[PDB]
Scaffold this active site. Structure first.
Site, PDB file in Angstrom:
ATOM      1  N   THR A  18      -4.327   4.611  -3.765  1.00 60.65           N
ATOM      2  CA  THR A  18      -3.326   5.492  -3.002  1.00 60.65           C
ATOM      3  C   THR A  18      -1.741   5.480  -3.685  1.00 60.65           C
ATOM      4  O   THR A  18      -1.277   6.501  -3.599  1.00 60.65           O
ATOM      5  CB  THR A  18      -3.099   4.585  -1.714  1.00 60.65           C
ATOM      6  OG1 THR A  18      -4.285   4.392  -0.943  1.00 60.65           O
ATOM      7  CG2 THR A  18      -2.263   5.435  -0.809  1.00 60.65           C
ATOM      8  N   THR A  19      -1.715   4.411  -4.466  1.00 62.53           N
ATOM      9  CA  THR A  19      -0.242   4.459  -5.560  1.00 62.53           C
ATOM     10  C   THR A  19      -0.453   5.567  -6.502  1.00 62.53           C
ATOM     11  O   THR A  19       0.595   6.155  -6.962  1.00 62.53           O
ATOM     12  CB  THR A  19       0.079   2.967  -5.917  1.00 62.53           C
ATOM     13  OG1 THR A  19      -0.186   2.172  -4.742  1.00 62.53           O
ATOM     14  CG2 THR A  19       1.652   3.114  -5.965  1.00 62.53           C
ATOM     15  N   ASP A  51      -8.131  -3.165   1.779  1.00 59.73           N
ATOM     16  CA  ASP A  51      -8.305  -2.566   0.585  1.00 59.73           C
ATOM     17  C   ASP A  51      -9.422  -3.330  -0.245  1.00 59.73           C
ATOM     18  O   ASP A  51     -10.208  -2.453  -0.972  1.00 59.73           O
ATOM     19  CB  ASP A  51      -6.828  -2.388  -0.050  1.00 59.73           C
ATOM     20  CG  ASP A  51      -5.947  -1.711   0.535  1.00 59.73           C
ATOM     21  OD1 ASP A  51      -6.018  -0.830   1.345  1.00 59.73           O
ATOM     22  OD2 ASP A  51      -4.578  -2.175   0.397  1.00 59.73           O
ATOM     23  N   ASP A  95       1.043  -1.123  -0.021  1.00 60.60           N
ATOM     24  CA  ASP A  95      -0.034  -0.066   0.002  1.00 60.60           C
ATOM     25  C   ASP A  95       0.785   1.216  -0.002  1.00 60.60           C
ATOM     26  O   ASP A  95       1.972   1.140   0.548  1.00 60.60           O
ATOM     27  CB  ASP A  95      -1.022   0.106   1.180  1.00 60.60           C
ATOM     28  CG  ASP A  95      -1.901   1.124   1.293  1.00 60.60           C
ATOM     29  OD1 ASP A  95      -2.154   1.874   0.209  1.00 60.60           O
ATOM     30  OD2 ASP A  95      -2.721   1.304   2.269  1.00 60.60           O
TER      31      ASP A  95
HETATM   32  N1  LIG Z   1      -5.804  -7.485 -13.386  1.00 58.70           N
HETATM   33  C1  LIG Z   1      -5.520  -6.438 -13.837  1.00 58.70           C
HETATM   34  N2  LIG Z   1      -5.626  -5.945 -15.231  1.00 58.70           N
HETATM   35  C2  LIG Z   1      -5.352  -4.722 -15.732  1.00 58.70           C
HETATM   36  N3  LIG Z   1      -5.153  -3.665 -14.869  1.00 58.70           N
HETATM   37  C3  LIG Z   1      -5.112  -3.980 -13.506  1.00 58.70           C
HETATM   38  C4  LIG Z   1      -5.208  -5.298 -12.810  1.00 58.70           C
HETATM   39  N4  LIG Z   1      -5.279  -5.229 -11.660  1.00 58.70           N
HETATM   40  C5  LIG Z   1      -5.025  -3.571 -11.190  1.00 58.70           C
HETATM   41  N5  LIG Z   1      -4.568  -3.058 -12.337  1.00 58.70           N
HETATM   42  C6  LIG Z   1      -4.295  -1.745 -12.328  1.00 58.70           C
HETATM   43  O1  LIG Z   1      -3.582  -1.324 -11.476  1.00 58.70           O
HETATM   44  C7  LIG Z   1      -3.841  -0.237 -10.649  1.00 58.70           C
HETATM   45  C8  LIG Z   1      -3.352  -0.042  -9.541  1.00 58.70           C
HETATM   46  O2  LIG Z   1      -3.916  -1.183  -8.610  1.00 58.70           O
HETATM   47  P1  LIG Z   1      -3.648  -1.461  -7.199  1.00 58.70           P
HETATM   48  O3  LIG Z   1      -2.166  -1.697  -6.867  1.00 58.70           O
HETATM   49  O4  LIG Z   1      -4.460  -2.742  -6.838  1.00 58.70           O
HETATM   50  O5  LIG Z   1      -4.327  -0.172  -6.487  1.00 58.70           O
HETATM   51  P2  LIG Z   1      -3.320   0.834  -5.453  1.00 58.70           P
HETATM   52  O6  LIG Z   1      -2.730   1.779  -6.590  1.00 58.70           O
HETATM   53  O7  LIG Z   1      -4.177   1.661  -4.875  1.00 58.70           O
HETATM   54  O8  LIG Z   1      -2.138   0.195  -4.984  1.00 58.70           O
HETATM   55  C9  LIG Z   1      -5.300   0.251 -11.097  1.00 58.70           C
HETATM   56  O9  LIG Z   1      -5.531   1.555 -11.461  1.00 58.70           O
HETATM   57  C10 LIG Z   1      -5.663  -1.077 -12.258  1.00 58.70           C
HETATM   58  O10 LIG Z   1      -6.433  -0.248 -13.498  1.00 58.70           O
END
Ligand SMILES: Nc1ncnc2c1ncn2[C@@H]1O[C@H](COP(=O)(O)OP(=O)(O)O)[C@@H](O)[C@H]1O
Ligand SMILES: Nc1ncnc2c1ncn2[C@@H]1O[C@H](COP(=O)(O)OP(=O)(O)O)[C@@H](O)[C@H]1O
Ligand SMILES: Nc1ncnc2c1ncn2[C@@H]1O[C@H](COP(=O)(O)OP(=O)(O)O)[C@@H](O)[C@H]1O
Ligand SMILES: Nc1ncnc2c1ncn2[C@@H]1O[C@H](COP(=O)(O)OP(=O)(O)O)[C@@H](O)[C@H]1O
Ligand SMILES: [Mg+2]
Ligand SMILES: [Mg+2]
Ligand SMILES: [Mg+2]
Lengths: 191, 535, 96, 550, 520
Positions: D98-99, D404, D65
């Site tokens: 958040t990222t 999350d 996170d």
């Molecule tokens: N299976 C997937 N296929 C395509 N894009 C994905 C997938 N999983 C996550 N993403 C992309 O990765 C980005 C960040 O996801 P995540 O790391 O879960 O959230 P955060 O940025 O809060 O850590 C999201 O904007 C999403 O569009």
């Protein structure tokens, strides 16, 4: 550690031949070629060998230009003597210059009267010994009370040349290191 | 990226500056240097005390001498050190004015930078204003070359008294100004004149008072005779009033070659022969000098002892050990030439002198010869005195500045009238052209106008007069009347017209104040990055 | 960034001058003027400061002109009073 | 990038640190932003990988996170603290993106600093972003999609896989997506006269390293981590309709109040006083034992007098616990949390209405741990999550990851409208804003153009984390999207493109509907606004002033 | 400067290289601590004690490594010990190999660390399938097979020579703690130690063993049928929860205050004598005045007993934890106590409590250990935890997997055969799972002095043709089938080894960078 270095460091080209039968040839001859090259450099640097009785116009060249030498910073030491024949120490110092001139041919030995050197010089301050090197005065020496005064010897003068950087400490020509043959003969028998 | 971030060596000592605030310190740093020497401008100035690291002390008011041999840290003040020096080397006058005028351009340029103008565009306005200012001063410039030598003789006093008036030498400005003028009469050619400054020597002895200083025609020596039994004052006899001064490079010594040599001395026959060799040499030596008929002989090196007595017998005094640089100057005044050797000595190459005497100075054990000439000779040597070591150095420097001010009059006869008259004349010339050529550089012309006004306001500030009434009177009067020789009267006279006050300045000197100032400030304004490596 | 761990953003000239610890006392007087401008009017806390620096820059050259500071100081008081007389003339009234 | 440090100035004397101005501040602020942006740039998306941070005592934390990794990175610089507190604001509000919000703010400050060097004022730059963002939120409303013609809970399952990804448990997303959706439907309640809301951190997390993450058991009910009071008590209560009594009363050899000082003249009163002082607590516990409370719950502790009384009746005791967990037990079982037992009348009593109801209760052993598992609640249903892993550091990673995942599905049910993911929103907003402001012309076309390029950093960051050809995907993304926006309304195929984009596993363009990549619309709403205010706070800074500590 | 970081950021490929080398280094420490010919390990803790053992868990407790990736490998032993209690070294040695085999690919063929994770879950799903098929059930009530099942883990320890006694010792202890599903727990298993004596005379005895003696000399040292009653409060005069602060006015009050101190202890003692117990075990201390009048009735008083032992006495004697003495009845009094006797040992006194032996609450017991020294006791005590841990899995799960590496080798063969039919990008990490599963056998072979080359080649040739129960004899170093060898282990330990080892690799493979020295 020093026992390995004394084989080469503490033996001249004449003494290195003692280890010809004992030590390896490649270990010995590699250093003899090095020491032989150093002997050749001193012969080329032997531009002097007698006292240069000069006069003033010339001082501005002999004393100072020489001190620059090649200017390879080939500096040359120039011992000046403001002689005064009335003083007893001056005639003693003149004898030391000619004696040292026959030995140290690379160092320039200069002599001039003190009355002709500086306008109205104090006679009490004579004899004066100046040492030039690369145009700069290394030592402005005063009368020889520091060097024993009237009882000054050749050993004291050679020791002064080592202090100003004119002659190395372990030089074979210095009387401190130049042990007599009879001295070394007794050491080998008692060893 | 790591925690270390290095591009050049020693980043801790090196520190940059940038922006408007970085330039702000530069002009304000010039105000500190200008404000120190602001009080020393004009006849009512006050000197500055200097102390070297070795303990030697001196006092002066010349801007180049003040700024010189001083420990500095900022680089902009070091440029002002090189500024004043420039004017000291070429001109020799105006060293404080060029720094104050340069600071005045910087102070007026700051206000402008703040209102909002590029710095190089500001310097372009001063260049068009400076060329228009010097061009307008050249238009209203009077030339004194048409007059004869008699009236031209008087004009040298009007300018020599100006530069000497701003020093401590001005207790008798009529007396010492003749010394600065009479020295140049003996070197001028009277047609396409050149100063030949190298002939004019200058030496001062610490002793007595300044009122006893009198100009002589000869060479001052700081050494005694070969023997003290010789006569002090030597006069000529019935004919040939010149004393036939013989000058020599090689001294009275045995001849020998330069190279190393050993003379092989045989049995007693050769030992007795060489005694006759040198004994006949001295007999040949004294016959050669008496054949030439010389009365005074000088060599750069000391004679032998026996030789000092052999000269004393025939009434033939001698000085010994005359410096090599000093030996050449003696031959020029005496209308002689130095012989290379003694075999070429003849009558034509001997000297000529009126009289010589060995002057004593109190109880001190020193001797000085004073050569004098009855007729006009080539060279001339100053003879300065004073009751201190520094006051002689101040009199030497004050006379040297006056000697360089009159030097400009010889090479350039076109003179001006300063003292606030040239500044207000050049300030309104650019102001009248500012509203004609509004453009965008009108503020630069107005800044150049107000920068020139700081000089007469500084003279009004030091003299105690009101700058309001002084500046308003000059601006109102000079706009009405076309006569452009009215300035700031600092001595408190009732009339401000400078025709009657006997003040004259050169055109080349007043021009360089504006040129070296406006050309420096272009460089000062073009600095943005300022890196100073700490020692 | 203050001495303690608190951080604060500030466009207000009064809060900028308040948090800035100034070594010079005369420059520190501008902190009280902005406090006075903030307490009385509450608007233009930086305009009073920049006009003060402009008048001091105007008074900088007048010190070299050779006029007494009290005459310069009293002149701004008369000029400031006349400036208020100009403001009341062009003051456009408004209704509640 | 800054070298040759600013010189100490003599004309400007301020106490404390030296003042520095110019473009070096915005260069240092951007340089401080890259120090934190490069940290979180690698751990983005499924292909992204995370890092470890030690706590200088042997302990460490492997964190995915952005809020957690920045919380432990105590940034001394002032500009970095804005983004650190923004992530703490982001995860508490929405719990997603958040990222990305830190990466969006870093790219904005990059290009904003480049625009300031291009000699346009920051006020015009900020006006260009606000008019662009107002059109962006208007465009987000256009690309909404209402869930319809979906079989069962498939829309809640596949949308959880997007949040479940970028973690260690993304491979097991097929197993955890069911229980996560079933957990939030179990804690449904009513509030504000019909408005559906779910409580914060209602589902529990129990750290039981053991078998595997695949065999995580969904216990349909409430779970509590507490040790048994006395080991002689029974660990399994048989029979249905088990009554649960929630209390906050304290029952230990109780002491009298502070302002009471006993003083007696008769020696014989110590027998009655010592017994009545202990016996006053027996009157409280004798009434609840007769009520038939099979399992009593309490927050404040119970001591050996009462503990033994409870056991002479086969009653389970409970030691210290948190104050918040007992509130949800009372809501699920139907009990009422009593701070102090009393009655409106002039006599103490204990009513039967305060008792809860549940079907079964049992103390299950999670391989070293005593945990009272309650299941089959009567009033309101409940749920708990049994996390399992290899070691305790993975269980800590499973805690915030489920937090999350639970937060994303929570906001999904608040608003039925959804938006696709996988850079399609950023790719569409790029081309949409490039077409915008062509009629405006003069000045704001360059500011909004660089703003449109700033949103493309997310599909570029996901590509390089996969170690593949990034520009090959960017050529397909933007071009396809453009060919969709320009198109006639009447063109089915082209319009569809508006719907799809980047894939990080297979490396080709596939449909998000069949793939299952989906996000909520609320995740993008108020994310760019927070990044906008984050950019405004640093971009408007000209000079930096530092006061040394006293 | 900037925040407390960026000292030396190990980023890119070199960060993962250090983790694979660090994870491999943990297994190399205990490489020789596997198999029947395993070597012991003496670790020196900084306090002053010493730990002599060969169990990988007990070794890794005392070690301390200043590296964050190796500490995650350190915690896997606590996963195995606090789940079953056997095979902790098997968990550490397998994971090392899994991280190591996957490394070639990570370093060179550039497969991203997520594609390896997807390959391992399908390998994990197939690993449980073949482990379920290779395991054969076994009857739980067969004591002859249960003794051979318990001594499978004892064979890798020092007490294999006393295996005939340890299996009888562990089997009787497990059945005592076993409750009639079939849940048992080791918290009541008393680990009390007695330095010195011979292992042959050491035996389990039903009941407890105290470290204390009776207080008064006249107490009966030999009771036929003890009747134990547990007390929580002290027999001293309770000061009370609030200050008394008696304002004395008359001279006849202070002697009354000191007299009621005698009468209150009489009142609590007289009501204890309503049931007439023989042994009164108090949790807190006891007074000198109260013990005499309990002796007048015939009780026996002891010193303060910690309640960890009283809870065992409550299940042995059937009594309940009692604090209020006024509510003492006849039903809650312990009964059916076998014998009471006190032996003389120079260390301390020891009071024995035997049970009559003749559903209800589960019974507790104390296992007597008579070792050679202090370290021999702690060595043997951990062997009982490793031996009794095996007895729980057969009751919870009747399945029984083959030992001697045959189970893990069966995973290696099926994953290797199925890797050819799994054509795609997942084939390279899927095939690398078999390369590590064939090492456990390799480690065993290497500790025997055998040659792993021809033995493993002979193993794979006979594993497909001969049978699924083939394995390596650790003592002789030849291929011997597990059916004739007669040594078997539970299947639950094989599940935790495969699950914990693969799940550990999925965590550590996602590590990108390492940044040390942030804050506390
Ligand atoms: N299976 C997937 N296929 C395509 N894009 C994905 C997938 N999983 C996550 N993403 C992309 O990765 C980005 C960040 O996801 P995540 O790391 O879960 O959230 P955060 O940025 O809060 O850590 C999201 O904007 C999403 O569009
Ligand atoms: N007696 C005088 N009457 C009027 N003006 C004078 C008088 N003496 C000097 N000045 C003016 O004051 C200026 C002073 O220059 P000065 O200080 O001598 O040169 P520097 O500034 O280089 O030392 C001169 O340029 C001249 O115009
Ligand atoms: N919209 C605008 N357009 C142009 N000038 C403005 C505008 N708003 C304010 N100003 C000018 O800028 C100044 C702003 O002063 P301000 O920053 O409000 O002072 P303070 O912040 O100390 O109250 C005002 O004096 C006004 O003349
Ligand atoms: N007699 C034996 N011969 C060959 N292999 C054995 C023998 N005993 C145990 N093993 C192997 O050693 C591994 C670990 O067994 P054990 O030593 O009991 O556990 P731990 O590793 O916890 O000490 C098992 O997987 C088994 O295959
Ligand atoms: Mg002058
Ligand atoms: Mg996420
Ligand atoms: Mg084992």
């Amino acid at each position: 550690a020093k026992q390995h270095e004394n084989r080469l460091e503490d033996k001249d080209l004449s003494d290195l031949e003692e280890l010809e039968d004992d030590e390896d040839e490649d270990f010995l001859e590699a250093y003899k070629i090095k020491r032989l090259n150093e002997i050749r450099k001193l012969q080329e640097r032997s531009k002097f060998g007698e006292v240069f009785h000069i006069n003033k116009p010339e001082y501005n060249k002999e004393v100072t230009l020489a001190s620059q030498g090649k200017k390879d910073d080939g500096g040359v030491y120039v011992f000046v003597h403001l002689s005064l024949q009335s003083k007893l120490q001056s005639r003693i110092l003149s004898h030391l210059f000619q004696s040292a001139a026959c030995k140290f041919r690379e160092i320039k030995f200069v002599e001039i009267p003190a009355n002709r050197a500086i306008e109205n010089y104090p006679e009490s301050n004579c004899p004066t010994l100046i040492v030039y090197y690369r145009g700069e005065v290394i030592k402005n020496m005063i009368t020889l009370l520091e060097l024993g005064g009237n009882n000054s010897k050749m050993e004291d003068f050679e020791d002064f040349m080592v202090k100003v950087g004119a002659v190395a400490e372990g030089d074979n020509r210095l009387i401190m290191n130049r042990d007599d043959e009879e001295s070394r003969e007794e050491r080998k028998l008692h060893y | 990226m790591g925690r270390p971030f290095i591009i050049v060596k020693d980043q801790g000592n090196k520190k940059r500056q940038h922006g408007l605030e970085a330039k702000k310190s530069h002009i304000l740093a010039a105000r500190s240097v200008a404000s120190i020497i602001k009080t020393s401008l004009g006849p009512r100035g006050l000197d500055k005390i200097l102390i070297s690291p070795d303990g030697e002390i001196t006092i002066t008011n010349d801007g180049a001498t003040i700024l010189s041999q001083m420990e500095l840290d900022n680089e902009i003040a070091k440029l002002l050190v090189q500024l004043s020096k420039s004017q000291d080397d070429e001109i020799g006058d105006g060293t404080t004015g060029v720094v104050v005028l340069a600071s005045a351009l910087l102070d007026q340029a700051l206000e402008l930078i703040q209102k909002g103008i590029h710095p190089i565009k500001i310097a372009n306005g001063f260049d068009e204003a400076a060329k228009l200012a010097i061009s307008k001063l050249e238009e209203t410039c009077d030339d004194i070359s048409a007059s004869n030598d008699e009236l031209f003789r008087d004009f040298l006093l009007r300018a020599a008294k100006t530069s000497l008036g701003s020093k401590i030498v001005s207790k008798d400005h009529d007396r010492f100004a003749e010394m600065a003028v009479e020295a140049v009469i003996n070197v001028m050619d009277k047609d396409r004149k050149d100063v030949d400054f190298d002939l004019i020597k200058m030496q001062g002895r610490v002793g007595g008072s300044i009122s006893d200083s009198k100009l002589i025609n000869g060479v001052i020596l700081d050494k005694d005779f070969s023997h003290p039994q010789m006569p002090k004052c030597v006069l000529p006899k019935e004919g040939s009033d010149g004393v036939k001064l013989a000058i020599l490079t090689c001294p009275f010594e045995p001849p020998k070659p330069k190279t190393k040599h050993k003379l092989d001395i045989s049995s007693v026959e050769e030992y007795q022969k060489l005694q006759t060799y040198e004994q006949d040499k001295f007999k040949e030596m004294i016959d050669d000098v008496k054949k030439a008929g010389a009365d005074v002989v000088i060599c750069q090196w000391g004679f032998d002892d026996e030789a000092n007595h052999l000269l004393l017998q025939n009434d033939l005094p001698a000085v010994r050990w005359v410096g090599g640089q000093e030996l050449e100057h003696i031959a020029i005044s005496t209308n002689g030439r130095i012989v290379p050797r003694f075999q070429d000595l003849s009558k034509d190459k001997l000297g000529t002198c009126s009289r010589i005497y060995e002057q004593e100075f109190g109880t001190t054990k020193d001797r000085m010869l004073i050569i004098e000439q009855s007729k006009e000779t080539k060279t001339v040597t100053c003879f300065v005195r004073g009751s201190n070591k520094m006051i002689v150095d101040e009199a030497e420097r004050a006379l040297h500045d006056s000697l360089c001010v009159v030097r400009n009059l010889v090479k350039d006869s076109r003179v001006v009238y300063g003292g606030g008259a040239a500044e207000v004349t050049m300030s309104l010339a650019v102001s009248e052209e500012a509203d004609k050529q509004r453009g965008i550089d009108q503020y630069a012309f107005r800044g150049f106008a107000q920068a020139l006004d700081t000089i007469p306001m500084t003279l009004a500030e030091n003299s105690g007069l009101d700058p309001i009434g002084t500046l308003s009177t000059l601006k109102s009067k000079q706009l009405k009347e076309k006569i452009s020789n009215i300035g700031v009267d600092c001595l408190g006279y009732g009339s401000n017209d400078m025709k009657e006050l006997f003040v004259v300045d050169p055109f080349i000197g007043k021009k360089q104040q504006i040129l070296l100032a406006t050309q420096l400030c272009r460089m000062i304004l073009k600095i943005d990055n300022v890196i100073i490596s700490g020692k | 960034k203050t001495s303690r761990g608190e951080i604060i953003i500030s466009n207000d000239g009064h809060t900028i001058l308040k948090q800035m610890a100034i070594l010079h006392p005369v420059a520190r007087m501008l902190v009280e003027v902005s406090a006075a401008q903030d307490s009385e009017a509450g608007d233009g806390t930086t305009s009073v400061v920049i006009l003060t620096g402009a008048l001091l820059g105007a008074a900088e050259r007048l010190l070299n002109k050779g006029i007494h500071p009290t005459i310069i100081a009293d002149s701004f008081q008369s000029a400031a009073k006349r400036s208020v007389d100009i403001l009341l003339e062009m003051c456009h009234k408004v209704s509640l | 990038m800054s070298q040759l440090f600013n010189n100490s100035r003599s004309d400007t004397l301020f106490l404390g640190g030296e003042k520095i101005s110019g473009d070096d501040i915005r260069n240092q602020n951007v340089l401080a932003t890259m120090a934190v942006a490069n940290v979180v740039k690698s751990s983005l998306g499924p292909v992204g990988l995370d890092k470890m941070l030690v706590d200088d005592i042997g302990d460490f934390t492997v964190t995915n996170d952005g809020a957690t990794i920045l919380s432990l990175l105590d940034v001394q610089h002032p500009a970095g603290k804005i983004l650190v507190e923004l992530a703490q604001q982001q995860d508490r509000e929405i719990g997603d993106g958040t990222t990305s919000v830190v990466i969006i703010a870093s790219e904005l400050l990059k290009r904003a600093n480049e625009l300031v060097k291009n000699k346009i004022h920051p006020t015009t730059i900020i006006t260009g972003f606000r008019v662009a963002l107002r059109e962006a939120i208007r465009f987000i409303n256009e690309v909404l999609s209402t869930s319809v013609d979906t079989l069962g809970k498939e829309t809640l399952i596949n949308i959880a896989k997007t949040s479940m990804s970028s973690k260690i448990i993304g491979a097991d997303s097929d197993f955890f997506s069911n229980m996560v959706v079933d957990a939030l439907l179990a804690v449904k309640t009513q509030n504000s006269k019909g408005e559906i809301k779910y409580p914060v951190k209602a589902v529990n997390v129990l750290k039981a390293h053991g078998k595997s993450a695949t065999e995580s058991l969904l216990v349909p009910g409430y779970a509590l981590n507490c040790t048994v009071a006395s080991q002689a008590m029974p660990k399994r209560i048989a029979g249905g309709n088990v009554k649960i009594a929630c209390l906050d009363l304290n029952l230990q050899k109780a002491r009298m109040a502070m302002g009471v000082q006993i003083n007696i003249d008769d020696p014989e009163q110590l027998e009655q006083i010592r017994k009545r002082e202990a016996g006053i607590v027996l009157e409280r516990v004798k009434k609840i034992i007769d009520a038939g409370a099979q399992v009593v719950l309490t927050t404040k502790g119970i001591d050996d007098l009462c503990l033994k009384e409870f056991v002479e009746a086969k009653i389970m005791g409970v030691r210290r616990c948190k104050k918040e967990d007992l509130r949800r037990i009372a809501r699920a079982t139907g009990a009422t949390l009593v701070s102090s037992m009393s009655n409106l009348e002039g006599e103490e009593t204990f009513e039967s209405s305060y008792l809860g109801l549940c079907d079964e209760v049992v103390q299950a052993k999670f391989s070293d741990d005593e945990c009272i598992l309650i299941k089959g609640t009567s009033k309101h249903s409940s749920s708990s999550i049994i996390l399992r892993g290899a070691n305790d550091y993975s269980l800590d990673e499973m805690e915030r990851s489920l937090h999350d995942s639970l937060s994303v599905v929570k906001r999904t049910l608040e608003s039925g409208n959804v938006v696709p993911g996988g850079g399609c929103v950023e790719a569409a907003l790029n081309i949409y804003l490039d077409n915008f402001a062509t009629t405006v012309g003069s000045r704001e076309q360059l500011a909004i153009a660089e703003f449109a390029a700033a949103l493309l950093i997310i599909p570029k960051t996901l590509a390089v984390n996969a170690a593949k050809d990034s520009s090959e995907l960017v050529a397909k993304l933007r071009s396809y999207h453009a060919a969709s926006q320009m198109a006639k309304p009447e063109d089915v195929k082209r319009r569809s493109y508006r719907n799809y984009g980047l894939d990080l596993i297979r490396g080709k363009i596939v449909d998000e509907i069949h793939a299952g990549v989906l996000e909520p619309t609320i995740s993008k709403v108020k994310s760019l606004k927070s990044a906008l205010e984050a950019c405004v706070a640093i971009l408007r800074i000209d000079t930096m002033i530092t006061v040394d500590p006293e | 400067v900037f925040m407390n970081a960026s000292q030396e950021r190990t980023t890119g490929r070199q960060a993962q290289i250090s983790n694979i080398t660090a994870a491999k280094a943990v297994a190399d420490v205990i490489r020789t601590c596997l198999g029947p010919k395993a070597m012991l390990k003496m670790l020196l803790d900084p306090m002053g004690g010493l730990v002599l053992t060969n169990d990988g868990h007990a070794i890794l407790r005392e070690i301390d490594v200043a590296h964050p990736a190796a500490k995650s490998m350190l915690e896997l032993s606590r996963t195995q010990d606090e789940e079953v209690g056997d095979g902790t070294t098997t968990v550490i040695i397998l994971a090392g190999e899994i991280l190591a085999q996957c490394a070639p690919y990570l370093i060179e063929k550039n497969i991203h660390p997520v594609i390896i994770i997807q390959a391992l879950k399908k390998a994990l799903t197939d690993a449980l399938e073949v482990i379920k098929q290779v395991s054969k059930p076994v009857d739980v009530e067969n004591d002859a097979a249960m003794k051979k099942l318990i001594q499978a883990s004892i064979g890798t320890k020092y007490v294999i020579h006393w295996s005939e006694k340890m299996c009888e010792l562990a089997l009787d202890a497990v059945k005592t703690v076993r409750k009639d599903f079939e849940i048992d727990i080791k918290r009541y298993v008393r680990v009390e130690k007695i330095p010195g004596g011979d292992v042959l005379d050491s035996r389990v005895l039903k009941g407890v063993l105290l470290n204390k003696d009776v207080v008064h000399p006249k107490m009966s040292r030999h009771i036929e049928n003890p009747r134990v009653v547990l007390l929580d409060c002290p027999l001293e005069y309770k000061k009370g929860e609030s200050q008394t602060n008696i304002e004395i006015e008359k001279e006849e009050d202070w002697n009354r205050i000191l007299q009621i101190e005698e009468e209150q202890v009489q009142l609590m003692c007289e009501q204890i004598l309503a049931v007439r117990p023989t042994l009164v075990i108090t949790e807190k201390g006891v007074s000198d005045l109260a013990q005499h009048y309990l002796l007048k009735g015939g009780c026996s008083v002891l010193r303060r007993v910690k309640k960890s032992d009283n809870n065992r006495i409550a299940r042995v004697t059937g009594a309940t934890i009692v604090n209020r003495v006024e509510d003492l009845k006849e039903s809650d009094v312990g009964t059916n106590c076998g014998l009471f006797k006190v032996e003389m040992i120079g260390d301390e006194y020891f009071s024995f409590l035997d049970n009559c032996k003749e559903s209800g609450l589960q019974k507790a017991c104390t296992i007597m250990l008579r070792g050679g020294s202090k370290d021999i006791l702690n060595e043997i005590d951990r062997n009982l935890q490793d031996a009794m841990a095996v007895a729980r899995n057969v009751m919870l799960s009747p399945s029984l997997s083959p030992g001697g590496g045959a189970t893990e080798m069966a995973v290696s063969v099926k994953l290797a055969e199925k890797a050819k039919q799994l054509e795609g990008i997942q084939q390279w990490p899927y095939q690398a799972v078999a390369d590590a599963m064939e090492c456990i056998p390799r480690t065993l072979i290497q500790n025997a002095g055998g040659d792993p080359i021809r033995l493993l080649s002979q193993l794979r040739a006979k594993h497909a043709q001969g049978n699924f129960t083939t394995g390596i004899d650790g003592d002789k170093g030849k291929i011997v089938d597990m059916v004739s060898y007669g040594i078997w282990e539970p299947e639950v330990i094989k599940q935790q080894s495969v699950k914990t080892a693969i799940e550990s690799a999925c965590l550590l493979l996602r590590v990108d960078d390492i940044v040390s020295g942030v804050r506390k």
